[PDB]
Structures are given as structure tokens and as C-alpha cells.
């Protein structure tokens, strides 16, 4: 079973630090273009970050570009999202949406809810 | 309190118990008795009959019970019903929608199925007394792309659509007698068992859920895959079935075990599978990959018995006759190579 | 074969390379279907057929006559000249219709796909072939190549009328079509630059089209034109003798051997050549 | 939010109906599959090389 | 009999092949088109402004005797990893992108990711994209009102300026043109990051002028087939 369990998150201060530990078990983690997506309360699923199969094609969305930092661990089969300098708009449930097709630089994991290879969802919230 | 999280925890513990029950009956695997049967060798089949009548890429095909008349779908809006014995096109059905993804030949040869991104399963009459072919029934109840369908009989069929739900249709009335709901991802293919009592459908959630055509519910869920299960085919024994997904690995699940028995993987082939079919004996697993070559996987040793040349585009459709006489592989080059 | 052995081996390997290339193209367009079903590929098929013809019934006779000094089948000199023209001007017209098809596919691709159907491609191929027929066979039946030591340039009264409609008008149409192709390609390349360079914020790709045209058009010119200018000025006579004119004839025929490496060099043809 | 609760309920009932089944041993399943293969290989033209006598394709 | 049913089947196959050869001409004539977006990104205004045309499933238009098959996907599901593979022999993927919805969810980043998945696809890599930066009539004032800013969802805006090869609209504020060309170049970045040469993006700006929009599609598909044939002949 393709299961993704994102450890960490919670409620932190806006502008601090946060690290999500997405346990990627059930598939060859070193062959899928794992990425990060979030879902704010009242907002749809938006793409956050992305990393290649080996860690070269690293890309983030404009809202987290330079702030967040993704890092895949092919040895531990886990995907990390080092959040730095958080913002009030970071109130969202971050999912671990995975690239369905391996060995490809393409996937539509930015789709709406009921997505197959998506994380179970960690409630990453900030204070005000 | 916290119905969502509590129900998710109960679902997680139920999945853990199911996995433990699967591993409990998994003292051995299909590869543990690999020394009891002789190998099959590299049997490189040749193109006995080539079919070049399509204009666009061929997305789906299906064989008939007579093992002579085969149907094929292409994005040009034509449903060419070939004659594999003499290389002749019996009919060229003008499809309502150009882009189509499914094919299902009736077990009696009188009907045929169509459908695609139009979310409508177009049933056409073949042996009608009106001369040419026409729309025998318009099954329009799906909200997603009608990926695949299979003909149980001239009265009721089941279609795997892109709305995460399958549905047992009814050619007599035209409505879904029962809907097969439970797939988390859009369904990509389904196959009927030789007993025709229950069927399994492979979706894009790495979980080929087994359904019951009678009760309309999901019997079992096979979560052994990793990527979008694009193809599926029920083992000729009726208790097992293979699955072809995008993870470049084919897996043979068994209904009586609720788990995968053999994983047909190979490092030389990294492209996913969108075509899976079994021969008359089920020993050969015809697997049409995305590398423009169909791999004839051995269902008992997990090794390809020889890739198939010819096709230069992705083979998205492949099927063996009811007697295993020949396998007709159609790819995205508007060609169908019938291998034997 | 002491000093003539070099030219003998050169002609031998020339015939072998021509035959190999043409047979490979024919086998790729008759065994496979991704190189015969396309409309623009029918002209390449016809070119390869004309090349196989000039390699089987034009090149070997001229080669053995050159390496033997004499002329085999002396009574068949007129028939061999008929075959030589029928093959060479057919190859030239095939190159011309290939360039015309490419110009139609580059300038007005929609009009090309609507008007230049496979039926229209067959009509154009037949037009080129019957043009070669009227240029070669009919003038031979009337003996238009005179004014058994079959070594002559051409009758001045027929040479001007033949090399013009056979090469000069075809080579002019080819020049115009390839120049318009280069202009449209450089316009598309300017657009591609305005896209990619802006995405990053030109002439490296604008030189690739020039190089591939000098390989396609420039090689054909540098092969056939040095022979056809002589064919046009030799019956007019400082001209060159018939001995050295054979070198230019063979240089022109070298375009026939180079055609498989020029036009069948695309990836679609190379993929079938690798498996064959 | 009620859609998520409905999906969770459906998943729970599906997993419960899947759990209380008769999952036979993988050894017995492989034995049945290999027995079916051995019994149906004699009439399988794809597995064994079929001559052009009764094969209407070659 | 010996030649009774066989000859009938042969003549039926001959008639079917004749019909198929007749249909191949119009199939090569009707260049199929894929019209999609990032979700309510203004594709309905494109279907409305397309030959004034079973709901939103497929529309056909013809200009200069060149008919087209624009297949709208406004009725499918959100997951698009399978039905988008059916557009592998398609001519142009007309991507109607809401160029002013960068603040509303970040729909602009969603469209960027959709265009990236379409570009680097295994089947859509040989097909160009007619990028239709729709909702320009709203972008005309979205950047000045401050309700939707580029820097809130794109930090590269500060490191970006209007290109020298830009064609602004008569009467447009420099900031509007700067944001429009920034979106265009952000699409073109991942467009040209493939480096294959088999397909190139065709960025256009729609929904600002109510003229014939299918004329732009015609002029784009013309150059599309031009560059396709050039790559076939190794000329580009
Ligand atoms: C031998 C001497 C007399 C010259 C004869 C000309 C030969 C080489 C030419 C003339 C007409 C030509 C044919 C015209 C049309 C076609 C259809 C095309 O789909 C495949 C090639 C094919 C079948 C050509 C093969 C070569 C051909 C037969
Ligand atoms: C010199 C020559 C020219 C000729 O014409 C063309 N040749 C090639 C292509 C087009 C032609 O026609 C053009 F004018 F339009 C045909 C035969 C010969 C010839 C050769 C080659 C020879 O070796 N011995 C010999 O006697 N003759 C007469």
C-alpha cells in the first residue's frame, strides 16, 4: 500500500522553523518525484515544493521560494520539508503528494482531494 | 470526538491487521516453488497478421469468443472490427466522440462497446438487420473518462470510468444497475473472470479492488502495487489476476490470498505497463509496456519470455484470444500486430 | 590494374555504397510502415527507387567501361544512354519534388496536408517520372544524342533543351524552394530565440539550418552542377576533354550514393536503419 | 467536512468486509495456479510453439 | 463456400478501407486541439469566443478552409494523469491560463505545474502548447489596485524586468506589461527547460480583445506544424 505519514508540524510561531518528516513506505522512494502540497482552510490544494528522484530538480512555489527547503532521503525513504521564516499564510494541511509515474519529470499530483498517492495530512499552523 | 481522526485510526489498524493476516498465510511465495516447473525459453513471437486501418493512435482493443473478429479503438473516431484470420475490417463504426479509451467485444459477437473522455459508453450492434452498424445503447451516467469496459452478455456490462467508481450497466434499459464505488483513484481497467460472477478493476491508486457483479460491492482490495494500475486481466483459472501499473512492475494477485504472489519486475525496463493479458494456460503473461515493446512475462518464474518488436509507439492495448491462439497488440501508431 | 586500380576500387565502393544505401531505404519503406505511410515520405521512396535504378543499370556499365577502357555492349550504347538519362534526370526531378514538398510543408503546412494528399504525392511522383521519360526515352528513339566507343558529351541542339528542363529548371526550383525554406526557418528561429532567450533573461540554431541545407542542397549542387555546366558547355566547343569529363560525371553520380545519407538521415529513418 | 466522514465510514466498512474473509495460504494458491498452468498448457498455442497446421494465423 | 463468403468479406474490407482513406484526408485536415486550464481559468470565455460554439466536450472551427477539433475537458475529473495521455497525437494543447488569478489558492502556480507536467510528459513532450494567458482584462487593473500582487506568490518578480523583445499594448501601464511578460517568461522557462526541440510554447494574451480568437489559434498552429516539419527535416 502506498502510504505517506508526515511526522511533525503542529502549532509554531510565525517566522520560526519547522520540519516535516514524511514517511514514504510502500514504494521505491528513490524513483518517484516526491513533492509537497498544502491545503489551507477554505482554499484548494496548492503545490508547495518538489524534488527530483535523486534530488537535483528542486523547485518550490512562489509563496515558499527561498523560505522552505525540501530534501529527500533515498536511504531512509522519507521526504523532508525544512520550513524557515514562516508566514501567517502557512496555515494549511501539508500533504506529501507523490509523483505517480516513476522515472518521469511529470505528474498531476496538484489535483483536488481524494488523490491516491498523497500524504495523510499534517496540520501545520501558525500563531497570530 | 474527532470522528475523522478516530475513523482514520481504525482504518489504519484494520489495514495493519489485514497486512498481518496476509503475511501470516505468506510463509512462502510464488518463487519458492520455482524449481518444480521447467522454464519456457525466449519465445520471440512474430507478426502473423498486421492490421493497418486506423488513422489515430490505438488506445483499446478486445477479442471475441470466436477468436477471429477483434475490435480496436482509436482517437480518430473509428471502431475498426478486424478479422484476424483474413486481415479484413468487418466494420468501421463512426464513433460519436473522437477520443476513446475502451473496447469490449460481446461474448456472442452481436454487440460491441465504445467510450472515452466523453464519459459515455457507446454500445453498437454488429449482427443487426439494419445493415451497417449503429448505436445500440448510449450508457451516459459517468462523470469521468470511461477508461475500460467488459462485456458480460448482451444485456449488462460493467465499465471502469474516471470518476473513481465503476458501474454495472444494462444494455436493455440503459441505467446503472449497481455502482462499484470505493476506488480512491480513477479506474483505468477492469477484467471479467471466466466464471463471470465477479470482476476486478485496476485503478490509479495502486489498489486493484475486487468487486462482485452480483452484490455490487467490493469483495477485496489488492494494495500490492506502487503506481497507477493501467491494465488488468483475470487469470484463466478464475481465482487470480495480473496487474500492469506505471511502476514498471507487474504483479499477479490471487483472490483466495488477498495479496500479491509474484512481482514481475526488471531493471532494464523502467517504463510503466498499460497492457496485461493472459494466454489460454495463464503461464505466459502478455505485458505491453511503454517502451514500444510487449514483454511476454512468465507467470511462474518472473522472467520475460521475449520482448516483442514491431510497434514503435506505446502499446496501450493487448489481448489474447479465448483459446490462447494469438495475441493482438495494438500501439499508438495506428497499427495492430497479432502475435502467435 | 596498376595505376587504374585506385579508380577501379573507388568506382566499386561507390556502387556498393549506392546499392547499400538505396536497398536500406527501400527495405525500411517496404518492411516498416512509419516511413511509407507519411505523405512526405513517398517522394523519398521515389528518390530511393530512382537511386536503386541508377545503381543497378547505369553505374556498373559505366564503371566497367571506365576500368576496361573499352565499352561493353557496343550495340547497346544508345540504350545505355537512354537508361542513364532516365535514371539521372529522374533522380534530379525526385530531389526537386522533395524540395517542393518540403517547401509546401514549411510555408503552408495546412495547404500541404489538404491539397498534397498521398494521391497528390503519387501524381507528383508520376509527373516527375514521365518528365524523365520524355527527357530520356523519346529523344533516344529519335537519336537526339549525336551530331562503339560510347564516349560523347551530348548533341548541342538537344543538350541545351535537355539539361535545362532536366537540371537547370529543377535546380532553379530547388534553389528557390530551399531559399524560401531557409527564410521561413530563420523566421521561426528568430521567434524561438525571442522565446527562449527571454525565458532565460539565436545564431547557434540559425547556423544549424544553414549547415543542414549545405549538406542537403549544397552537396547536391557541388556534385551535379560541376557536371551539368560541362554537359551544357562541352557540346558548345576553354572546354575540357571527354576523359576528365568522366570524373565530373562520377562526381555527379556520387550524389546518388550520398542521397541515403542526406535525405534518409532523420531519426525516423535512422531507427529503421539501425535494426536493419 | 461531512464528505470526509462519509469517505472514512466507507473505508472502514470496506476494510471490515475485507478482513473477515478466508485468506488461503500463498503456497496453496501457487500450487493451484501451477496445477492450472500444467493442465491448460497442452491446449495453449502461445506457451508451446504451435505449428501452422491448426493455427490459422501463421 | 470456397469463394462466396471470402469474396464478400474482401469487398467489405475494400469498402471499409476506401471509407478510411476518405476519412484520413479530413483527419489530417482537422488538426485536433486540447483546450484545458487550471480550473475555471477562463476557458468558458474561450469556448464562447470560438466559432460561437453533450455540453462542453468538443468544439470545431474552420478558418482558411483549415478545420480544427478543439476538445474541451470542462466535464472530466480533476485527476489528469490518464485522460491527458489520450492527447498524444493531438496537434496543439491550447492552455487557457488565468493570468490574473495568482492571488486567488495561487492558481497561477497551479497552471505552471500543469504546464510543467504537460511539457515533461512521456507522450505530450512532442506536442506544443498554445499558452492563452486569459483574464488579461482583469490583469489590466489587478496589479495597480494592490488586491493581487505578483510578489505575494512569485519572488522572481523583483529580479525580472520587461524584455527587449516585448510587444506592449497601446495604453498599458508598464507594471501591467511587466507582470504579463513575467508570467509569460515563467511559463517559457519550464517550456525551454526540456531542451528537446520537438515542441515549443506559443504564449498569447487573450480575454483583453474581443476579436476573432480562433485566428490566433490558426496562426499558432500554422507555425506549430511549420516547426514540426522543420524538426522532421532537421531544419530547426
Ligand atoms: C525500370 C525502369 C523502366 C524504370 C521504372 C521506374 C520505377 C523505378 C518507378 C516508376 C513508378 C514507381 C512507383 C510509383 C508509385 C509507388 C507507390 C509508393 O507508395 C511506393 C513506390 C511506388 C510503387 C513506386 C516504385 C518505383 C516505380 C515503379
Ligand atoms: C555525357 C552524357 C550525358 C548524358 O546526359 C545526362 N546525363 C546525366 C544526367 C542528365 C543528362 O541529361 C541532361 F543533359 F539533361 C547522358 C549520357 C552521357 C554519356 C555518358 C555518361 C557516358 O559515359 N558516355 C556517353 O557516351 N554519354 C553520352
mmCIF file of N, CA and C in Angstrom, chain C residues 234-274:
data_model
loop_
_atom_site.group_PDB
_atom_site.id
_atom_site.type_symbol
_atom_site.label_atom_id
_atom_site.label_comp_id
_atom_site.label_asym_id
_atom_site.label_seq_id
_atom_site.Cartn_x
_atom_site.Cartn_y
_atom_site.Cartn_z
ATOM 1 N N UNK C 234 30.270 21.660 -73.020
ATOM 2 C CA UNK C 234 31.088 20.769 -73.840
ATOM 3 C C UNK C 234 30.578 20.627 -75.271
ATOM 4 N N UNK C 235 29.281 20.434 -75.538
ATOM 5 C CA UNK C 235 28.831 20.432 -76.940
ATOM 6 C C UNK C 235 28.969 21.782 -77.617
ATOM 7 N N UNK C 236 29.133 22.862 -76.853
ATOM 8 C CA UNK C 236 29.359 24.180 -77.429
ATOM 9 C C UNK C 236 30.776 24.362 -77.957
ATOM 10 N N UNK C 237 31.686 23.441 -77.650
ATOM 11 C CA UNK C 237 33.065 23.539 -78.115
ATOM 12 C C UNK C 237 33.399 22.394 -79.065
ATOM 13 N N UNK C 238 37.579 27.880 -72.562
ATOM 14 C CA UNK C 238 38.210 26.602 -72.867
ATOM 15 C C UNK C 238 37.470 25.451 -72.196
ATOM 16 N N UNK C 239 36.958 24.531 -73.007
ATOM 17 C CA UNK C 239 36.232 23.375 -72.504
ATOM 18 C C UNK C 239 37.225 22.304 -72.054
ATOM 19 N N UNK C 240 36.711 21.186 -71.549
ATOM 20 C CA UNK C 240 37.541 20.097 -71.053
ATOM 21 C C UNK C 240 37.300 18.871 -71.924
ATOM 22 N N UNK C 241 38.304 18.000 -71.986
ATOM 23 C CA UNK C 241 38.210 16.798 -72.799
ATOM 24 C C UNK C 241 37.208 15.814 -72.194
ATOM 25 N N UNK C 242 36.888 14.777 -72.972
ATOM 26 C CA UNK C 242 35.939 13.767 -72.518
ATOM 27 C C UNK C 242 36.534 12.842 -71.465
ATOM 28 N N UNK C 243 37.863 12.770 -71.368
ATOM 29 C CA UNK C 243 38.486 11.916 -70.362
ATOM 30 C C UNK C 243 38.250 12.461 -68.959
ATOM 31 N N UNK C 244 38.561 13.741 -68.741
ATOM 32 C CA UNK C 244 38.325 14.359 -67.443
ATOM 33 C C UNK C 244 36.852 14.645 -67.189
ATOM 34 N N UNK C 245 36.027 14.695 -68.238
ATOM 35 C CA UNK C 245 34.593 14.881 -68.047
ATOM 36 C C UNK C 245 33.964 13.675 -67.363
ATOM 37 N N UNK C 246 34.559 12.491 -67.527
ATOM 38 C CA UNK C 246 34.068 11.313 -66.822
ATOM 39 C C UNK C 246 34.236 11.461 -65.316
ATOM 40 N N UNK C 247 35.288 12.158 -64.879
ATOM 41 C CA UNK C 247 35.473 12.412 -63.453
ATOM 42 C C UNK C 247 34.330 13.261 -62.914
ATOM 43 N N UNK C 248 33.903 14.269 -63.679
ATOM 44 C CA UNK C 248 32.777 15.090 -63.248
ATOM 45 C C UNK C 248 31.464 14.320 -63.310
ATOM 46 N N UNK C 249 31.313 13.431 -64.293
ATOM 47 C CA UNK C 249 30.126 12.577 -64.343
ATOM 48 C C UNK C 249 30.049 11.702 -63.096
ATOM 49 N N UNK C 250 31.183 11.131 -62.684
ATOM 50 C CA UNK C 250 31.192 10.299 -61.485
ATOM 51 C C UNK C 250 31.000 11.130 -60.222
ATOM 52 N N UNK C 251 31.517 12.360 -60.198
ATOM 53 C CA UNK C 251 31.259 13.244 -59.066
ATOM 54 C C UNK C 251 29.775 13.577 -58.961
ATOM 55 N N UNK C 252 29.109 13.751 -60.103
ATOM 56 C CA UNK C 252 27.672 13.968 -60.084
ATOM 57 C C UNK C 252 26.907 12.741 -59.633
ATOM 58 N N UNK C 253 27.331 11.560 -60.087
ATOM 59 C CA UNK C 253 26.706 10.321 -59.637
ATOM 60 C C UNK C 253 26.969 10.041 -58.163
ATOM 61 N N UNK C 254 28.020 10.631 -57.589
ATOM 62 C CA UNK C 254 28.265 10.485 -56.159
ATOM 63 C C UNK C 254 27.127 11.054 -55.322
ATOM 64 N N UNK C 255 26.389 12.034 -55.851
ATOM 65 C CA UNK C 255 25.189 12.500 -55.166
ATOM 66 C C UNK C 255 24.167 11.382 -55.026
ATOM 67 N N UNK C 256 24.128 10.458 -55.988
ATOM 68 C CA UNK C 256 23.214 9.326 -55.882
ATOM 69 C C UNK C 256 23.584 8.428 -54.708
ATOM 70 N N UNK C 257 24.883 8.239 -54.467
ATOM 71 C CA UNK C 257 25.309 7.449 -53.318
ATOM 72 C C UNK C 257 25.121 8.211 -52.013
ATOM 73 N N UNK C 258 25.234 9.540 -52.054
ATOM 74 C CA UNK C 258 25.091 10.343 -50.845
ATOM 75 C C UNK C 258 23.637 10.606 -50.467
ATOM 76 N N UNK C 259 22.701 10.419 -51.398
ATOM 77 C CA UNK C 259 21.293 10.669 -51.093
ATOM 78 C C UNK C 259 20.764 9.882 -49.897
ATOM 79 N N UNK C 260 21.087 8.597 -49.702
ATOM 80 C CA UNK C 260 20.618 7.922 -48.479
ATOM 81 C C UNK C 260 21.167 8.534 -47.202
ATOM 82 N N UNK C 261 22.406 9.033 -47.218
ATOM 83 C CA UNK C 261 22.967 9.682 -46.034
ATOM 84 C C UNK C 261 22.447 11.100 -45.859
ATOM 85 N N UNK C 262 21.826 11.673 -46.888
ATOM 86 C CA UNK C 262 21.363 13.055 -46.838
ATOM 87 C C UNK C 262 19.893 13.108 -46.442
ATOM 88 N N UNK C 263 19.034 12.448 -47.221
ATOM 89 C CA UNK C 263 17.595 12.545 -47.008
ATOM 90 C C UNK C 263 17.061 11.511 -46.028
ATOM 91 N N UNK C 264 17.662 10.321 -45.975
ATOM 92 C CA UNK C 264 17.272 9.296 -45.016
ATOM 93 C C UNK C 264 18.085 9.364 -43.728
ATOM 94 N N UNK C 265 18.588 10.546 -43.375
ATOM 95 C CA UNK C 265 19.396 10.732 -42.179
ATOM 96 C C UNK C 265 18.572 11.092 -40.949
ATOM 97 N N UNK C 266 17.268 11.308 -41.103
ATOM 98 C CA UNK C 266 16.428 11.666 -39.973
ATOM 99 C C UNK C 266 16.352 10.516 -38.971
ATOM 100 N N UNK C 267 15.876 10.841 -37.765
ATOM 101 C CA UNK C 267 15.780 9.834 -36.714
ATOM 102 C C UNK C 267 14.783 8.742 -37.069
ATOM 103 N N UNK C 268 13.707 9.093 -37.779
ATOM 104 C CA UNK C 268 12.713 8.094 -38.160
ATOM 105 C C UNK C 268 13.304 7.065 -39.115
ATOM 106 N N UNK C 269 14.192 7.499 -40.011
ATOM 107 C CA UNK C 269 14.854 6.566 -40.916
ATOM 108 C C UNK C 269 16.051 5.891 -40.260
ATOM 109 N N UNK C 270 16.759 6.599 -39.377
ATOM 110 C CA UNK C 270 17.913 6.004 -38.711
ATOM 111 C C UNK C 270 17.498 4.902 -37.746
ATOM 112 N N UNK C 271 16.323 5.032 -37.121
ATOM 113 C CA UNK C 271 15.844 3.983 -36.228
ATOM 114 C C UNK C 271 15.568 2.689 -36.983
ATOM 115 N N UNK C 272 15.050 2.786 -38.209
ATOM 116 C CA UNK C 272 14.847 1.595 -39.025
ATOM 117 C C UNK C 272 16.152 1.095 -39.632
ATOM 118 N N UNK C 273 17.099 1.998 -39.897
ATOM 119 C CA UNK C 273 18.395 1.576 -40.419
ATOM 120 C C UNK C 273 19.207 0.827 -39.370
ATOM 121 N N UNK C 274 19.061 1.194 -38.096
ATOM 122 C CA UNK C 274 19.812 0.519 -37.042
ATOM 123 C C UNK C 274 19.358 -0.926 -36.876
#
